[PDB]
Amino acid sequence: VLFQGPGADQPIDADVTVIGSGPGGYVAAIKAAQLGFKTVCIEKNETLGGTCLNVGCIPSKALLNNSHYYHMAHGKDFASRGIEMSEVRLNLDKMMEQKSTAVKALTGGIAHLFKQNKVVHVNGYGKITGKNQVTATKADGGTQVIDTKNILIATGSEVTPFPGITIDEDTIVSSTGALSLKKVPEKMVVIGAGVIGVELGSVWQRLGADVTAVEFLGHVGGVGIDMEISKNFQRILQKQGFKFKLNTKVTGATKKSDGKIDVSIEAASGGKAEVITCDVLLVCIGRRPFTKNLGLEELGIELDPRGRIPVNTRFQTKIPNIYAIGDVVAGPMLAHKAEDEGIICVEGMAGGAVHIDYNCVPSVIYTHPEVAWVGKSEEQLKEEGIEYKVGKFPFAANSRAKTNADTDGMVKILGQKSTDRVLGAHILGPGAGEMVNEAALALEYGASCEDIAGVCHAHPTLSEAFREANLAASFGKSINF
Amino acid sequence: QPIDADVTVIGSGPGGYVAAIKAAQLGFKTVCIEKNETLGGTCLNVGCIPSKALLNNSHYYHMAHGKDFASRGIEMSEVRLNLDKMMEQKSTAVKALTGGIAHLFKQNKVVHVNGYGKITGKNQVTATKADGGTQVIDTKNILIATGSEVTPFPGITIDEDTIVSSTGALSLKKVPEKMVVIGAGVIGVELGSVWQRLGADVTAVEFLGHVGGVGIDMEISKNFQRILQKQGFKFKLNTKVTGATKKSDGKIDVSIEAASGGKAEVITCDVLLVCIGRRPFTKNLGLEELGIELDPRGRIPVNTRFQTKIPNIYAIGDVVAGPMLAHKAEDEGIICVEGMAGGAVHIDYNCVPSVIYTHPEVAWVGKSEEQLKEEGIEYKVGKFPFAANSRAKTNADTDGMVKILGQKSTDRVLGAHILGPGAGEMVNEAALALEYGASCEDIAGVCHAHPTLSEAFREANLAASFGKSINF
Ligand SMILES: Cc1cc2nc3c(=O)[nH]c(=O)nc-3n(C[C@H](O)[C@H](O)[C@H](O)COP(=O)(O)OP(=O)(O)OC[C@H]3O[C@@H](n4cnc5c(N)ncnc54)[C@H](O)[C@@H]3O)c2cc1C
Ligand SMILES: Cc1cc2nc3c(=O)[nH]c(=O)nc-3n(C[C@H](O)[C@H](O)[C@H](O)COP(=O)(O)OP(=O)(O)OC[C@H]3O[C@@H](n4cnc5c(N)ncnc54)[C@H](O)[C@@H]3O)c2cc1C
């Protein structure tokens, strides 16, 4: 009953039909059921959980964690603590096994949560075949009709191809291939110095690869990152051994008879042609919304120029019982962003209020040091003409960071010049990813720098650097720097 | 000859040194007197900093020497402990941070006077240096920040050789074969776990029925103890120590019995760590001559501006009531000197977090289930296990849970209790929530980054507010 795979082809009735089981879709489906909707979730892949669980956040963070520890043991860190080892060897098969075990446990966990919440899981390719109808086509050629009051499109994203360079997941890989390399490549080129490219580059650099990322724009870490943070981050990564060719375009790549790859590059504006050689080429120039063969054209739901489905503040498409959330709509392509939109979307279906402040959605890069930010960058505040002040506190002056010999970076707080309102929080250093959620909570309430400075933060913690940067922004001066 | 000052701070621990810096930043001509050879007090020199350094280093030793790294494909043939080097890393951190305080004093024009400070008049402090030389400070206000000392165990003499306080245990020269810990509070569990990881056979003996000290939630404490026992840390709860004998062969015979009486036995160890408590330190400060009486536990009573009964003489930190924690002392110091300058003075001690830096960590803020039951408060519970958290699962580090206690009628968060990875950092988001009077629904609606451990905090609040989390 709760699983409808090949051979289960009876017609189904539902209140809410969710197409896709990524962070947006599977959370929307659970919550819709908890709200009392008869809920169906359609997924074409053999496991639930979408991009993030299967080929995304989860496997990448596992390899970031394990490769950091390899670096701690293999490099200078453990020796400096009196932990003396004869020979530190990499067993990549086992490291990859730890990654795969986490993914399996969590995709099985979604299946369990669907059963616990009475979500009907239809395994098949969903196509919208009427304003109130979704048809799922299964692996055996069977079809199953779902008559449904509401439809929630959560069909996610795909890798953006690079014209003329064919990803084969062998020597020319997407993030998916790069998460499962069978051996550490001697040299790797990464096209795109965005979040995903920097994370995957750092993983393989730690494990022994010579890594260069080639990026068309003039900074690392993607859109909206604060420029000071990005420059300092880049400098720290270069000191680790991660090389960057910014303001550079790739014009082509050739797989050679010796098995290596020649990548032709030039200045982004033109000139300075060069060739660089690698063993593995990772193509991560972007990701884009996935709506293939969903029936949107026949419904009249037109896409925006970038392939996104336009929606209103309730996440309704122009057809008011058909909704869309997550990577298939505008906004940052992030798992927690998709999840939050899914929840508020189905809460709205049930009569509740619908509101999300995208100024309060954090971004995180899970390198070491981590990078995390929420709210506005300095460049954004300048663009918008908003007057602001700055407080900074370096982790070199934080007691927890210093005691652990882990002192890269700073916290930077941007406050409104006259009102002391926190406008943005930018963290470069240990624990940034966890710390930014304290900032997100402050932004929710419209808190001031003075507010945060008055909160008693535990000593010794990295979070004290966040407190002190807010004190500096509010009073002009921190205590410990 | 005499120094003239607006504010004279006696003691340079977390309360005093922060108070001195802030007072100078507010425009007070400020003096800080310290009797010890370095600044930073108990926390920097024999407290938080060396203890967290050995906790970090011993945890990493455990990961390399045990099963954890091998399961990640990080294969090492022989993992050996160099305790001398581990202690050097600890000492290097302490040295750097105590030097940082001296630099900050210079940066902020805080005059550092080295000596034993005695209040010798309502407006005068005299510092006596080790050779008997004196420095008199004539001062408008005096801020007592003289801190704490170890609480002795009657009949057992700590000598920092085989019977140690936390100070001796932070600098043992070799791993003891067998160590007994008197007191399973925060300090004892931390230092016991350090030495257990490094190879010692460790038993903590505790008079009461739970570990982790006053105010810890009982469910959290029981689950925490279960995890530590699985690691190899042994506990004798509901057990009293009646005496300890230093033997001719250098070992220690410890006599114990059931806390209520009966079941006498003797256990033998190489090192006995005595950590039953800490107590305020005011010795030879001149309080009796001024007429400043102590409360029955030795604390200086103060008003909400931290004034003693002599209103230009103040006290903050471990020498006054409230939780004996570094961040508590620092906040009291800051607001005390802000008050001297005319500003508002508020601290909500229900919003002061506690952290135990074991692995797993423990951290909490607000009220325990037991405190709410005592006070007659009607509440609801939300729980979320780290086994269901994506970041924890991805790191293969899934012990524990977040437990949220909410008010039934208003949905206000009354308490947050975390057992597991990242608890110490996570509790600061919880302290912000309590300071702001957040509801469980508030936190559940805040977009937390995915995957982060903090999502367990979000989900436990969702469970308390709505009745059900998403991922469990
Ligand atoms: C390498 C990598 C690392 C990342 N790391 C992070 C990170 O640390 N943090 C973060 O927040 N984000 C991260 N992301 C991004 C994150 O994975 C996405 O933002 C998120 O998965 C989007 O969720 P979604 O539910 O919108 O879409 P998706 O996760 O893409 O899920 C869509 C699902 O719908 C299914 N589907 C599509 N069409 C149909 C159809 N017609 N019928 C049936 N099923 C269909 C697909 O098979 C898929 O399972 C990362 C991404 C990558 C690639
Ligand atoms: C092993 C251990 C671990 C700890 N870990 C933590 C932790 O992780 N987190 C936490 O929050 N707390 C921790 N604490 C508690 C923390 O150390 C104290 O709460 C904090 O140090 C109190 O600060 P204070 O400024 O009030 O006093 P203290 O730090 O005790 O400083 C008092 C100072 O005054 C000096 N002094 C006293 N009398 C005079 C005098 N007459 N003249 C001159 N100088 C004088 C002393 O020499 C000392 O330097 C720990 C304590 C111990 C023992």
XYZ file of N, CA, C and O in Angstrom, chain A residues 343-473:
524
model
N 8.226 23.009 3.621
C 7.413 23.067 4.840
C 6.392 24.195 4.749
O 5.189 23.992 4.960
N 6.855 25.407 4.429
C 5.923 26.521 4.463
C 4.918 26.387 3.327
O 3.779 26.848 3.444
N 5.320 25.772 2.210
C 4.384 25.540 1.116
C 3.212 24.674 1.570
O 2.048 25.062 1.424
N 3.491 23.518 2.185
C 2.379 22.650 2.570
C 1.632 23.192 3.794
O 0.419 22.978 3.918
N 2.312 23.914 4.701
C 1.594 24.639 5.754
C 0.609 25.633 5.147
O -0.526 25.766 5.621
N 1.010 26.313 4.070
C 0.086 27.202 3.385
C -1.080 26.462 2.756
O -2.220 26.932 2.794
N -0.818 25.294 2.168
C -1.922 24.488 1.667
C -2.937 24.218 2.768
O -4.146 24.158 2.514
N -2.472 24.050 3.998
C -3.381 23.725 5.086
C -3.998 24.960 5.726
O -4.725 24.832 6.713
N -3.749 26.146 5.181
C -4.400 27.341 5.677
C -3.495 28.266 6.455
O -3.954 29.318 6.915
N -2.246 27.890 6.654
C -1.347 28.662 7.478
C -0.695 29.807 6.733
O -0.904 30.002 5.535
N 0.052 30.608 7.495
C 0.806 31.727 6.950
C 2.023 31.241 6.169
O 2.600 30.189 6.459
N 2.420 32.032 5.175
C 3.525 31.683 4.292
C 4.441 32.890 4.212
O 4.031 33.966 3.760
N 5.666 32.717 4.677
C 6.640 33.789 4.665
C 7.995 33.164 4.924
O 8.130 32.288 5.784
N 8.972 33.592 4.148
C 10.362 33.205 4.323
C 11.186 34.447 4.024
O 10.894 35.189 3.081
N 12.174 34.707 4.867
C 13.082 35.840 4.707
C 14.365 35.255 4.118
O 15.129 34.580 4.813
N 14.575 35.461 2.813
C 15.760 34.904 2.157
C 17.026 35.607 2.605
O 18.128 35.079 2.411
N 16.883 36.777 3.215
C 17.992 37.426 3.887
C 18.441 36.664 5.125
O 19.449 37.051 5.720
N 17.702 35.633 5.555
C 18.056 34.860 6.743
C 18.464 33.420 6.413
O 18.549 32.585 7.320
N 18.755 33.134 5.143
C 19.126 31.793 4.697
C 20.659 31.701 4.678
O 21.288 32.374 3.847
N 21.271 30.867 5.510
C 22.740 30.806 5.530
C 23.325 29.999 4.372
O 22.643 29.221 3.702
N 24.606 30.278 4.099
C 25.453 29.530 3.175
C 26.685 29.046 3.929
O 27.222 29.769 4.778
N 27.140 27.835 3.601
C 28.281 27.221 4.266
C 29.155 26.512 3.239
O 28.647 25.829 2.342
N 30.472 26.678 3.399
C 31.507 25.920 2.698
C 32.226 25.085 3.754
O 32.787 25.640 4.710
N 32.212 23.756 3.586
C 32.657 22.832 4.628
C 34.119 22.433 4.491
O 34.496 21.304 4.832
N 34.941 23.323 3.958
C 36.379 23.150 3.963
C 36.892 23.320 5.389
O 36.125 23.509 6.337
N 38.203 23.233 5.564
C 38.828 23.603 6.832
C 39.921 24.617 6.524
O 40.928 24.254 5.881
N 39.771 25.891 6.920
C 38.643 26.419 7.695
C 37.349 26.433 6.883
O 37.365 26.453 5.649
N 36.236 26.391 7.605
C 34.914 26.558 7.033
C 34.670 28.021 6.716
O 35.360 28.919 7.203
N 33.695 28.249 5.854
C 33.210 29.584 5.556
C 31.699 29.535 5.698
O 31.058 28.617 5.176
N 31.119 30.543 6.344
C 29.672 30.574 6.499
C 29.217 32.017 6.595
O 29.875 32.834 7.242
N 28.069 32.321 5.998
C 27.569 33.681 6.098
C 26.060 33.687 5.963
O 25.452 32.764 5.414
N 25.464 34.764 6.460
C 24.029 34.963 6.351
C 23.765 36.461 6.357
O 24.484 37.243 6.988
N 22.745 36.859 5.601
C 22.429 38.261 5.456
C 23.195 38.862 4.299
O 23.375 38.195 3.277
N 23.671 40.096 4.451
C 24.247 40.856 3.350
C 25.764 40.957 3.480
O 26.301 41.070 4.589
N 26.442 40.915 2.335
C 27.854 41.233 2.195
C 28.082 42.746 2.179
O 27.160 43.534 1.955
N 29.348 43.154 2.356
C 29.697 44.565 2.194
C 29.354 45.070 0.794
O 28.868 46.197 0.638
N 29.606 44.250 -0.241
C 29.334 44.672 -1.614
C 27.839 44.886 -1.818
O 27.431 45.821 -2.516
N 27.007 44.041 -1.196
C 25.562 44.212 -1.292
C 25.084 45.473 -0.591
O 24.229 46.192 -1.115
N 25.602 45.746 0.607
C 25.178 46.944 1.319
C 25.584 48.198 0.558
O 24.828 49.175 0.495
N 26.775 48.189 -0.036
C 27.190 49.322 -0.852
C 26.280 49.493 -2.065
O 25.858 50.611 -2.387
N 25.969 48.394 -2.757
C 25.082 48.481 -3.913
C 23.752 49.120 -3.540
O 23.205 49.930 -4.298
N 23.185 48.710 -2.403
C 21.863 49.147 -1.968
C 21.897 50.502 -1.274
O 20.837 51.009 -0.891
N 23.077 51.100 -1.121
C 23.201 52.404 -0.505
C 22.985 52.451 0.988
O 22.750 53.532 1.533
N 23.088 51.318 1.670
C 22.830 51.225 3.106
C 24.107 51.571 3.867
O 25.178 51.029 3.574
N 23.999 52.463 4.854
C 25.157 52.832 5.666
C 25.381 51.836 6.798
O 24.450 51.507 7.537
N 26.617 51.368 6.951
C 26.883 50.288 7.889
C 28.221 50.512 8.579
O 29.015 51.371 8.192
N 28.436 49.747 9.647
C 29.702 49.712 10.362
C 30.150 48.259 10.463
O 29.372 47.326 10.243
N 31.422 48.074 10.795
C 32.066 46.770 10.748
C 32.683 46.452 12.100
O 33.378 47.292 12.682
N 32.437 45.232 12.583
C 33.189 44.635 13.669
C 33.832 43.317 13.263
O 33.212 42.482 12.594
N 35.101 43.144 13.626
C 35.857 41.951 13.286
C 36.533 41.408 14.533
O 36.961 42.165 15.408
N 36.665 40.080 14.589
C 37.399 39.463 15.672
C 38.143 38.269 15.070
O 37.504 37.410 14.439
N 39.467 38.187 15.223
C 40.201 37.076 14.592
C 40.203 35.837 15.475
O 40.291 35.920 16.699
N 40.121 34.655 14.852
C 40.184 33.447 15.678
C 41.542 33.270 16.361
O 41.612 32.574 17.381
N 42.606 33.911 15.864
C 43.895 33.878 16.551
C 43.797 34.423 17.976
O 44.651 34.101 18.807
N 42.773 35.225 18.290
C 42.583 35.758 19.637
C 41.520 35.027 20.451
O 41.264 35.413 21.598
N 40.897 33.998 19.889
C 39.888 33.201 20.576
C 40.554 32.059 21.335
O 41.404 31.352 20.787
N 40.155 31.884 22.597
C 40.788 30.907 23.475
C 40.591 29.476 22.990
O 41.543 28.685 23.002
N 39.391 29.118 22.525
C 39.218 27.738 22.080
C 40.058 27.467 20.830
O 40.718 26.427 20.732
N 40.065 28.401 19.873
C 40.833 28.208 18.647
C 42.322 28.094 18.946
O 43.013 27.200 18.436
N 42.828 28.992 19.795
C 44.243 28.980 20.135
C 44.628 27.708 20.873
O 45.674 27.115 20.596
N 43.808 27.284 21.836
C 44.134 26.078 22.590
C 44.207 24.859 21.673
O 45.055 23.980 21.870
N 43.349 24.804 20.646
C 43.393 23.684 19.712
C 44.372 23.908 18.566
O 44.473 23.049 17.684
N 45.110 25.019 18.564
C 46.049 25.318 17.483
C 45.327 25.324 16.132
O 45.742 24.680 15.170
N 44.249 26.096 16.054
C 43.323 26.074 14.921
C 42.792 27.499 14.775
O 41.648 27.797 15.098
N 43.629 28.402 14.249
C 43.391 29.833 14.416
C 43.212 30.617 13.121
O 43.331 31.849 13.142
N 42.938 29.961 12.000
C 42.695 30.699 10.769
C 41.439 31.556 10.898
O 40.432 31.120 11.463
N 41.478 32.755 10.320
C 40.258 33.469 9.986
C 39.751 34.447 11.031
O 40.459 34.890 11.945
N 38.467 34.778 10.872
C 37.825 35.843 11.627
C 36.312 35.718 11.529
O 35.774 35.050 10.639
N 35.640 36.427 12.438
C 34.225 36.746 12.311
C 34.111 38.217 11.925
O 34.751 39.078 12.544
N 33.292 38.505 10.913
C 33.009 39.877 10.508
C 31.510 40.136 10.579
O 30.717 39.447 9.924
N 31.137 41.156 11.347
C 29.751 41.557 11.534
C 29.560 42.913 10.871
O 30.353 43.837 11.086
N 28.489 43.030 10.096
C 28.080 44.277 9.466
C 26.813 44.750 10.166
O 25.805 44.033 10.177
N 26.870 45.942 10.752
C 25.735 46.516 11.449
C 25.312 47.820 10.801
O 26.130 48.551 10.243
N 24.024 48.113 10.886
C 23.528 49.369 10.343
C 24.125 50.517 11.159
O 24.179 50.458 12.395
N 24.608 51.546 10.451
C 25.437 52.576 11.069
C 24.724 53.275 12.213
O 25.348 53.609 13.225
N 23.438 53.564 12.050
C 22.717 54.347 13.045
C 21.952 53.510 14.057
O 21.869 53.901 15.228
N 21.469 52.332 13.661
C 20.551 51.563 14.485
C 21.200 50.358 15.164
O 20.577 49.756 16.047
N 22.410 49.965 14.755
C 23.117 48.800 15.297
C 22.444 47.484 14.926
O 22.808 46.424 15.442
N 21.495 47.522 14.011
C 20.866 46.314 13.516
C 21.884 45.423 12.823
O 22.628 45.897 11.969
N 21.887 44.125 13.139
C 22.770 43.201 12.428
C 22.257 43.045 11.002
O 21.109 42.636 10.786
N 23.103 43.373 10.025
C 22.762 43.236 8.613
C 23.377 42.022 7.943
O 22.838 41.529 6.942
N 24.503 41.555 8.456
C 25.188 40.432 7.870
C 26.221 39.890 8.830
O 26.806 40.636 9.621
N 26.451 38.585 8.760
C 27.437 37.907 9.587
C 28.244 36.994 8.681
O 27.674 36.189 7.936
N 29.564 37.102 8.760
C 30.463 36.430 7.827
C 31.564 35.775 8.632
O 32.313 36.459 9.337
N 31.664 34.455 8.523
C 32.554 33.691 9.382
C 33.525 32.906 8.518
O 33.113 32.117 7.654
N 34.814 33.092 8.779
C 35.858 32.310 8.125
C 36.703 31.677 9.219
O 37.376 32.386 9.971
N 36.667 30.354 9.337
C 37.396 29.716 10.406
C 36.777 28.440 10.925
O 35.818 27.902 10.361
N 37.351 27.915 12.006
C 36.824 26.674 12.584
C 35.387 26.883 13.032
O 35.039 27.946 13.545
N 34.542 25.875 12.793
C 33.170 25.861 13.282
C 32.203 26.858 12.675
O 31.113 27.051 13.233
N 32.560 27.482 11.545
C 31.714 28.500 10.930
C 30.319 27.965 10.648
O 29.326 28.666 10.871
N 30.228 26.725 10.149
C 28.939 26.165 9.760
C 27.945 26.057 10.905
O 26.756 26.348 10.738
N 28.409 25.665 12.087
C 27.489 25.604 13.216
C 27.188 27.006 13.736
O 26.042 27.306 14.097
N 28.215 27.870 13.755
C 28.119 29.210 14.328
C 27.144 30.092 13.561
O 26.473 30.933 14.165
N 27.027 29.908 12.247
C 26.143 30.770 11.473
C 24.677 30.592 11.868
O 23.865 31.489 11.622
N 24.302 29.474 12.486
C 22.906 29.316 12.889
C 22.551 30.184 14.086
O 21.387 30.583 14.223
N 23.517 30.490 14.956
C 23.280 31.527 15.954
C 22.994 32.863 15.265
O 22.064 33.584 15.645
N 23.757 33.189 14.219
C 23.500 34.422 13.483
C 22.132 34.394 12.810
O 21.417 35.400 12.805
N 21.733 33.250 12.250
C 20.429 33.180 11.595
C 19.299 33.436 12.586
O 18.320 34.126 12.276
N 19.436 32.912 13.799
C 18.429 33.159 14.821
C 18.365 34.641 15.184
O 17.273 35.211 15.291
N 19.518 35.291 15.352
C 19.524 36.724 15.633
C 18.846 37.510 14.517
O 18.070 38.436 14.775
N 19.159 37.184 13.265
C 18.536 37.890 12.152
C 17.016 37.703 12.150
O 16.278 38.632 11.804
N 16.524 36.510 12.507
C 15.075 36.296 12.570
C 14.366 37.345 13.422
O 13.290 37.827 13.049
N 14.928 37.676 14.586
C 14.341 38.632 15.517
C 14.687 40.083 15.196
O 14.224 40.993 15.898
N 15.506 40.322 14.180
C 15.939 41.680 13.904
C 16.839 42.213 14.998
O 16.784 43.408 15.325
N 17.681 41.350 15.561
C 18.531 41.677 16.692
C 19.608 42.686 16.307
O 19.981 42.836 15.138
N 20.101 43.389 17.322
C 21.223 44.303 17.194
C 22.544 43.653 17.586
O 22.595 42.614 18.248
N 23.632 44.295 17.171
C 24.948 43.863 17.627
C 25.027 43.882 19.151
O 25.533 42.932 19.763
N 24.485 44.940 19.777
C 24.442 45.048 21.234
C 23.691 43.874 21.851
O 24.107 43.348 22.891
N 22.593 43.437 21.211
C 21.841 42.281 21.698
C 22.755 41.070 21.843
O 22.787 40.412 22.892
N 23.495 40.754 20.776
C 24.307 39.544 20.761
C 25.444 39.664 21.762
O 25.794 38.698 22.450
N 26.068 40.838 21.825
C 27.137 41.085 22.787
C 26.679 40.885 24.233
O 27.497 40.538 25.097
N 25.390 41.093 24.519
C 24.853 40.885 25.854
C 24.504 39.449 26.204
O 24.192 39.171 27.369
N 24.573 38.533 25.234
C 24.309 37.118 25.482
C 25.556 36.478 26.077
O 26.673 36.683 25.583
N 25.370 35.718 27.152
C 26.469 35.037 27.831
C 26.837 33.782 27.046
O 26.170 32.751 27.158
N 27.929 33.856 26.282
C 28.463 32.729 25.525
C 29.450 31.945 26.385
O 30.264 32.541 27.105
N 29.394 30.612 26.287
C 30.235 29.761 27.123
C 31.707 29.998 26.811
O 32.081 30.302 25.677
N 32.541 29.889 27.842
C 33.982 30.021 27.698
C 34.614 28.686 28.056
O 34.275 28.117 29.104
N 35.550 28.163 27.257
C 36.063 28.679 25.982
C 35.314 28.079 24.822
O 35.236 26.849 24.749
N 34.756 28.917 23.950
C 34.111 28.427 22.745
C 34.454 29.324 21.563
O 34.719 30.522 21.714
N 34.423 28.727 20.372
C 34.575 29.503 19.152
C 33.520 30.590 19.073
O 33.777 31.674 18.535
N 32.329 30.323 19.614
C 31.246 31.290 19.526
C 31.594 32.610 20.198
O 30.944 33.626 19.924
N 32.588 32.630 21.086
C 32.939 33.898 21.712
C 33.478 34.891 20.692
O 33.328 36.105 20.879
N 34.076 34.401 19.600
C 34.544 35.289 18.545
C 33.370 35.990 17.877
O 33.479 37.152 17.476
N 32.240 35.293 17.749
C 31.014 35.897 17.236
C 30.497 36.971 18.187
O 30.155 38.080 17.757
N 30.458 36.667 19.490
C 30.094 37.670 20.484
C 30.982 38.906 20.378
O 30.493 40.042 20.365
N 32.303 38.697 20.322
C 33.247 39.806 20.367
C 33.178 40.665 19.117
O 33.318 41.889 19.200
N 32.960 40.051 17.953
C 32.823 40.844 16.738
C 31.574 41.709 16.806
O 31.571 42.847 16.323
N 30.504 41.195 17.416
C 29.325 42.024 17.627
C 29.599 43.136 18.631
O 29.090 44.252 18.481
N 30.352 42.840 19.692
C 30.746 43.890 20.627
C 31.553 44.976 19.912
O 31.332 46.178 20.123
N 32.504 44.570 19.067
C 33.308 45.536 18.328
C 32.441 46.399 17.429
O 32.657 47.611 17.316
N 31.456 45.785 16.771
C 30.567 46.538 15.897
C 29.719 47.513 16.698
O 29.484 48.647 16.267
